[PDB]
């Protein structure tokens, strides 16, 4: 098989920016190279065909270069949207081959996390669960520390946390940190508080509620 | 326009087969190839194999001999791929994709089918509504959430008003947790418009057949 080699996994840049991706092909594939963006959720996108020329509707942003064996993939001025990973393959011969994927990461400025706290709703609660939530809404960059307090005592057990990608229109992230308690315990308590921490602040963002009121 | 629709997540038991469906409309099915791709979670694209519909002539990735079968059906524009001796090795995206004779490319691409290869059996979530406790300080916005808790197999999809909010939307992605998913789905909105206007999110389970609808309420 022709290996089509993205040495790299991921490469950040900065919307309005150049960004090259490179595919290196393990023998001659001439031309026969194109290159797919694929956003998260969704199917890879046709962008460049034939090592250079751009798919039908396809910004003028997008160009493709190379033949033989080195390949490269170019965004003129990166856009939020195009976080994306970026495929090389090869029609050369078959089996058809894919590169590995270089994703696309998007440094903009540090913005701090929206929050938002949620305690169990009544409906979880009549199962005899209760999961209090935390949203950290549109922050960046990635790194982010959510410390849970239950009366004031830090809780660790039972917290799940979800990033997004980054936000295909401002490029930050969010995540959901969900603590899970039985009902029982959970009206063991009252002061339920998510504390997040986030480089662009000494102070934590904390957001809390009691359960009494 | 050109479409390929694929046929639905799967959840398949280990060692049975699978045969996902791909059907073209918006062009002359005869004058593409039909081939497909596997997305293992988180990994690349890899090519399973392709068809001709003009003569049912097939081309396969010689790693997916005996494992993948493709067939076509011209009269109704539909490619399948089998997928037999099935293992969460094969859980997976499976895409349908065509490609001219000429040039050489995949240009339009199906939706994707995830196939899932697990015993573990169809749980529906629970969904539950995020909404501010009462304690909380209305600001120019207000973000809501619904909680999609315990359900497999992933497929989940959360829509807010109809898609009609979709532009404030986060989707937190699942995690898996004793067997079982959670993930859960934001949207902001101005505070002018919620609670003083509807805001419900729907969530679907396709494995499940269900969809709860939850009407945020402070």
């Known amino acids: 098989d022709i290996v089509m080699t993205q040495s790299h996994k991921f490469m950040s840049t900065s919307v309005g920016d150049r960004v090259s991706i490179t595919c290196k092909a393990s023998?001659?594939?001439?031309?026969?190279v194109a290159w797919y963006q694929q956003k998260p959720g969704q199917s890879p996108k046709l962008l460049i065909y034939?090592?250079?020329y751009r798919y039908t509707g396809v910004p003028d942003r997008f160009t493709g270069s190379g033949s033989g064996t080195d390949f490269t993939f170019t965004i003129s001025s990166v856009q939020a949207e195009d976080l994306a990973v970026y495929y090389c393959?090869?029609?050369?011969?078959?089996?058809?081959?894919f590169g590995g994927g270089t994703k696309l990461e998007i440094k903009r400025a540090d913005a701090a996390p929206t929050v938002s706290i949620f305690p169990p709703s009544s409906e979880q609660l009549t199962s005899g669960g209760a999961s209090v939530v935390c949203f950290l809404n549109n922050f960046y960059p990635k790194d982010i520390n959510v410390k849970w307090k239950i009366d004031g005592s830090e809780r660790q057990n039972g917290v799940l946390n979800s990033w997004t990608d980054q936000d295909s229109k401002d490029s930050t992230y969010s995540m959901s940190s969900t603590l899970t308690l039985t009902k029982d315990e959970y009206e063991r308590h009252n002061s339920y508080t998510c504390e997040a921490t986030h480089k662009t602040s000494t102070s934590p963002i904390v957001k809390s509620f009691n359960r009494n009121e | 326009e050109v479409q390929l629709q694929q046929s639905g997540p799967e959840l398949v038991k280990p060692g049975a087969s699978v045969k996902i469906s791909c059907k073209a409309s918006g062009y002359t099915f005869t004058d593409y190839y039909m081939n497909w791709v596997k997305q293992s979670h988180g990994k690349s694209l890899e090519w399973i194999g392709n068809?001709?519909?003009?003569?049912?002539?097939?081309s396969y990735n010689q790693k997916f001999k005996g494992k993948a079968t493709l067939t076509v059906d011209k009269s109704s524009t539909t490619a399948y791929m089998e997928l037999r001796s099935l293992t969460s090795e094969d859980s997976a995206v499976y895409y349908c994709?065509?490609?001219?004779?000429?040039?050489?490319?995949?240009?339009?691409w199906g939706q994707g089918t995830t196939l899932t290869v697990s015993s573990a059996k169809t749980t529906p979530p629970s969904v539950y509504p995020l909404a501010p406790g009462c304690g909380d300080t209305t600001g120019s916005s207000v973000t809501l959430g619904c909680l999609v808790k315990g359900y497999f197999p992933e497929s989940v999809t959360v829509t807010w008003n109809s898609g009609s909010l979709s532009s404030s939307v986060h989707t937190f992605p699942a995690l898996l947790q004793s067997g079982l998913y959670t993930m859960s789905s934001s949207v902001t909105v101005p505070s002018s418009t919620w609670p003083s206007q509807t805001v419900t999110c729907s969530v679907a389970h396709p494995a499940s057949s269900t969809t709860v609808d939850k009407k945020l309420e402070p």
């Open positions: 023998q001659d594939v001439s031309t026969a």
């Open positions: 393959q090869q029609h050369y011969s078959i089996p058809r081959t």
């Open positions: 068809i001709n519909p003009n003569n049912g002539g097939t």
């Open positions: 034939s090592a250079s």
């Open positions: 994709t065509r490609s001219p004779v000429r040039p050489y490319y995949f240009d339009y």
